[PDB]
Each structure stands twice: as structure tokens, then as C-alpha cells.
Amino acid sequence: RPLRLPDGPPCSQRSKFLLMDALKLSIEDPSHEGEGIPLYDAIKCMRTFFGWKEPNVVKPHEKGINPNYLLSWKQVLAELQDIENEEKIPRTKNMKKTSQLKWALGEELRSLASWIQNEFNKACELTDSSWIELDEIGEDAAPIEHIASMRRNYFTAEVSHCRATEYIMKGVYINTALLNASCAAMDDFQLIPMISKCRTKEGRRKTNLYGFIIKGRSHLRNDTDVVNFVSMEFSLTDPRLEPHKWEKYCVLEVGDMLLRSAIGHVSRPMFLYVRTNGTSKIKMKWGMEMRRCLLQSLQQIESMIEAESSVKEKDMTKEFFENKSPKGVEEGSIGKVCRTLLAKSVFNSLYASPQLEGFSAESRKLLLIVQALRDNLLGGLYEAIEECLINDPWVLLNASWFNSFLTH
Numbered sequence: 001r002p003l004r005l006p007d008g009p010p011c012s013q014r015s016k017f018l019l020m021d022a023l024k025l026s027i028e029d030p031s032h033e034g035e036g037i038p039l040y041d042a043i044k045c046m047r048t049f050f051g052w053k054e055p056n057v058v059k060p061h062e063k064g065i066n067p068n069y070l071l072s073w074k075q076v077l078a079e080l081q082d083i084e085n086e087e088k089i090p091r092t093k094n095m096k097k098t099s100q101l102k103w104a105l106g107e108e109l110r111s112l113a114s115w116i117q118n119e120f121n122k123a124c125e126l127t128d129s130s131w132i133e134l135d136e137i138g139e140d141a142a143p144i145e146h147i148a149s150m151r152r153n154y155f156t157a158e159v160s161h162c163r164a165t166e167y168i169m170k171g172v173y174i175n176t177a178l179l180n181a182s183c184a185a186m187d188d189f190q191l192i193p194m195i196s197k198c199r200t201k202e203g204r205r206k207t208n209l210y211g212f213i214i215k216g217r218s219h220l221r222n223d224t225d226v227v228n229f230v231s232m233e234f235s236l237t238d239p240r241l242e243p244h245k246w247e248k249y250c251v252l253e254v255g256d257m258l259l260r261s262a263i264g265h266v267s268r269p270m271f272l273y274v275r276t277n278g279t280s281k282i283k284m285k286w287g288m289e290m291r292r293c294l295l296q297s298l299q300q301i302e303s304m305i306e307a308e309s310s311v312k313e314k315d316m317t318k319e320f321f322e323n324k325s326p327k328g329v330e331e332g333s334i335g336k337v338c339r340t341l342l343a344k345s346v347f348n349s350l351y352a353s354p355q356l357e358g359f360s361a362e363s364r365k366l367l368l369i370v371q372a373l374r375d376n377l378l379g380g381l382y383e384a385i386e387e388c389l390i391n392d393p394w395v396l397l398n399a400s401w402f403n404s405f406l407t408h
């Protein structure tokens with residue numbers, strides 16, 4: 001019996017920032033007066049693009065006030081143009097409490113869509129930039145022993161350029177920026193750049209701008225108190241191809257960009273995905289800890305090497321990572337296994353939900369029971385699992401995968 005997934009309209013994107021659809025404005029080897037202050041970086045990144053144009057709504061949010069989203073983006077540009085005229089650039093920028101910002105800051109069964117699998121495939125790929133330093137993974141106080149060191153360097157080589165790792169660092173940056181603003185600027189609608197940092201294949205340091213968030217008032221007394229925010233993220237993805245993915249967004253067309261491509265130079269429209277959203281102190285603390293995804297994934301690999309090692313009365317680290325008893329690798333390479341485990345850990349973090357917690361525990365129970373019947377040859381457990389298959393894309397996709405592990 002395969003699990004029954006729900007019927008209904010396709011599920012929609014619900015992460016805190018864009019994943020496969022993001023777009024970066026970037027500055028190489030940055031060195032302007034104030035390199036390392038988010039606002040200065042963001043402006044220098046904005047100054048690298050000359051294709052801006054009069055923005056308009058191309059995919060409206062069906063349940064919000066689309067003129068207010070438009071006005072909020074035009075306000076961001078207008079207030080950044082103001083900083084261009086102030087002699088000293090300030091360290092932070094508090095937006096005017098306009099009617100559009102006050103409104104935007106607050107002052108059902110869904111079937112499985114194909115985009116979430118595509119998102120997961122993209123998260124497993126390699127980018128052309130590295131996102132972590134060589135000794136990033138780990139917290140140890142002492143120098144690490146020789147075997148642990150070898151394992152960490154092999155694993156880091158495989159995941160440092162991984163797209164899942166860019167999501168980790170992107171998520172760590174924005175969650176740190178927002179939580180700091182949440183208490184350093186409680187009464188302000190602070191403009192908060194979405195920044196990441198990477199090193200190219202030639203060693204060049206690069207600073208990237210994905211867009212902006214504007215936080216609401218944040219008098220966060222406890223871990224569960226909510227700070228609302230508005231996110232505005234560049235993208236080359238035309239939202240009119242998969243409109244169901246963007247149910248929660250108003251999408252603007254805000255410029256045109258010249259690109260290298262397989263057909264040579266091409267001009268493509270640039271979009272801005274805008275939605276309102278919220279987070280809590282506890283969720284931002286968790287978002288600051290996303291580098292533990294790297295550690296949790298490494299430890300799953302170290303578990304497999306420990307198994308093979310205690311079987312051969314010998315350390316199997318070199319033999320595992322160099323692919324030397326097994327005569328292949330199902331995913332295709334050891335690198336893909338590392339990046340698939342990483343991607344699972346990152347998406348569990350980016351798409352955390354009670355639905356995910358139930359399905360994770362309850363489907364493990366159904367698995368062990370099925371494995372014990374397959375090697376050696378329930379209606380209430382099946383219900384506890386399917387009570388978590390409601391509308392969450394990550395959970396629905398993991399259930400789709402579970403059915404495949406059932407048919408085999």
C-alpha cells in the first residue's frame with residue numbers, strides 16, 4: 001500500500017528567501033571606503049547594474065494590496081538614492097514609516113508540484129564559487145586527531161562549492177542581520193541587505209546582493225514573539241511559467257539584464273519577488289545555526305566509514321572517499337552522496353514544520369516494520385503519517401520519495 005497524497009491545487013513556495021530562483025548582483029575583490037558594512041556593500045552592488053526601469057506588477061498577489069508592494073520597492077530605490085546625496089554614508093538606513101510599509105508590516109489541501117523536486121536537485125549541484133573556509137566545519141576546542149582531519153578535508157572538498165552550502169551561508173547572514181536589527185533597532189523599519197560572500201575558482205573574494213528585507217517593529221519579549229518583514233528579491237525567473245509556486249508573492253518587473261549565454265549576448269528581464277513574512281527569535285537563532293547542517297551531514301558520512309572500517313579491521317576513509325564489498329555508488333559518485341545528505345539537512349532546516357516532524361518520526365516507524373517484513377517473507381500508523389500530508393511541499397516530496405522506497 002502506497003501512501004495517499006492529498007488532492008488539490010499545487011503547493012506553493014514557502015521558504016524565507018528564494019532558492020533556485022535567486023539572482024545576485026556582485027562586486028569582485030571589494031575595496032570601497034567601508035568594505036564589510038552591509039549597506040555600503042549593497043549600494044556598491046546596486047551601482048553595478050544599469051538596467052533598472054520603471055517597475056510594474058507582472059504577477060499580482062491575489063490576497064494583498066499590490067500598489068503597496070510596488071510603492072515599497074520604489075521607496076527602497078528612492079531612499080538609496082538619498083544616501084547617494086548624503087556626504088557621509090550612514091551605517092544603517094531606517095525607512096520612513098509610509099502607509100505602504102505600515103500596511104505591509106502589519107501596523108487547505110495542496111497536491112505535490114514538480115518545482116520542489118527541482119529545487120532539491122538544484123540544491124545538490126556544484127556552483128563555481130566556494131562558500132566556506134577550509135576549517136569551517138566543527139567546533140572542537142582541541143586540535144582534531146588525524147583520521148577526523150582527513151575525513152573533514154575530503155568532505156569539505158565535496159560540499160564547499162555546493163549550492164546547499166550557499167543556502168546555509170545566505171541563511172546564516174540574513175538571520176544574523178535580522179536578529180541583530182530586531183534588538184538594536186526595535187522601533188525602526190530598518191532596511192536590511194540580503195548578502196552572501198564567496199571565493200571564485202581563481203581565489204577572488206566576491207560579495208553578493210540577493211535583495212533587501214525591511215523589518216517591522218520588533219519588541220521581542222520571548223522566543224516566539226514575531227517580527228514581521230517584507231522581502232524583495234531579484235530573480236530572472238518569469239513567475240508566469242509556474243504561477244502556483246508564487247501564490248504568496250507579488251512579482252515586479254524592475255529592469256533588464258545583459259547576459260552571456262549559449263546563444264551569445266542576450267537581454268533578459270529582471271524580476272523582483274516581493275512578499276510579507278515573519279519570523280521569531282527562536283527561528284532566527286536556528287537560522288544562525290545552519291552551519292550545523294554541514295556537521296550533521298559529515299557525521300552521517302563518518303557513520304558509514306565507521307561501519308566499513310570496523311568490518312575491515314582497518315580505517316576505510318581513503319577507500320571510501322576515493323571509491324575503491326561495494327563495486328560502485330548508487331547516486332553516481334561519493335561527491336553526490338555528500339551533497340545529497342547536505343541538501344536533505346539544509347531543506348529540513350529551510351522547510352522546518354510540525355508536518356515535517358510528524359512525518360519524520362512516523363514514517364521511520366513504518367519503514368522498520370516494512371524492512372522487517374521484506375527480509376523475513378497498521379491502519380492507525382498510516383493515519384498518523386497521512387495526518388501530516390496536508391500542504392507542505394517538502395513533506396509532500398519526502399512522501400513521494402517514500403512511495404518509491406515502497407515500490408522497491
Ligand SMILES: Fc1ccc(-n2ccnc2)cc1
Pocket residue numbers: 043046047052053077078080081
Ligand atoms: F543604488 C541605486 C539606487 C537607486 C537606483 N535607482 C534605479 C532607478 N531609480 C533609482 C539605482 C541604484
